[PDB]
Amino acid sequence: VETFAFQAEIAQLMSLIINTFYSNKEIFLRELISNSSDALDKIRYESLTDPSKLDSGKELHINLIPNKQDRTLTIVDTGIGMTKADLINNLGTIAKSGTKAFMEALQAGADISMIGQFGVGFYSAYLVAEKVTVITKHNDDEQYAWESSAGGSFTVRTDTGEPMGRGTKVILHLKEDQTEYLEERRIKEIVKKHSQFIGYPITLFVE
């Protein structure tokens, strides 16, 4: 287990998301589905030049899995996945610039729903989640588990859990008052409204 401090800007963005009064919390789903779609595009683009990349899974899809018992919503995709380096770099200087621009825009009157336009849409997960876990598997590396309850730090460990071939899984440990995102009619309503034009199949699982 390795513990890391978030960069100053990201820690700042995260406490801003957790402490600002915002009712339109549903925007997290579109942001996560969007990131899933980008990873799926990346693996499909790599299979033109190298068809052997689809060996770890041929199917390109997105699964939405609510679990009322664990109070979790899981967003699984069979995209390109992330290596330990890709994972560390994505929480690094690449995000720093977008984070500062978005926080500057929020002062000027921009709302939290514009987060994706600055490439930091992942952090909207903290509008509904008290903890976020990210399990990822890339063809060129091992399976990794990333975790943060915010608080200025995150952990990275080699995942000992069930293998997933290739892709990324985002597990949102929902706040007690956010269990509406476990409901079928509510997830359907959000996906139909915010992510109706995704070039990949999205399956909402039942309980």
Ligand SMILES: CN1CCC(c2ccc(N(C)C(=O)c3cc4c(CCC(C)(C)C)[nH]nc4cc3O)cc2)CC1
């Ligand atoms: C405007 N840009 C923003 C970053 C965009 C991007 C999209 C996808 C991925 N890859 C390769 C993923 O495997 C993946 C990551 C995901 C995250 C972020 C997890 C975090 C711990 C913060 C690194 N959330 N949901 C995900 C679903 C995914 O399949 C990396 C970057 C690329 C475009």
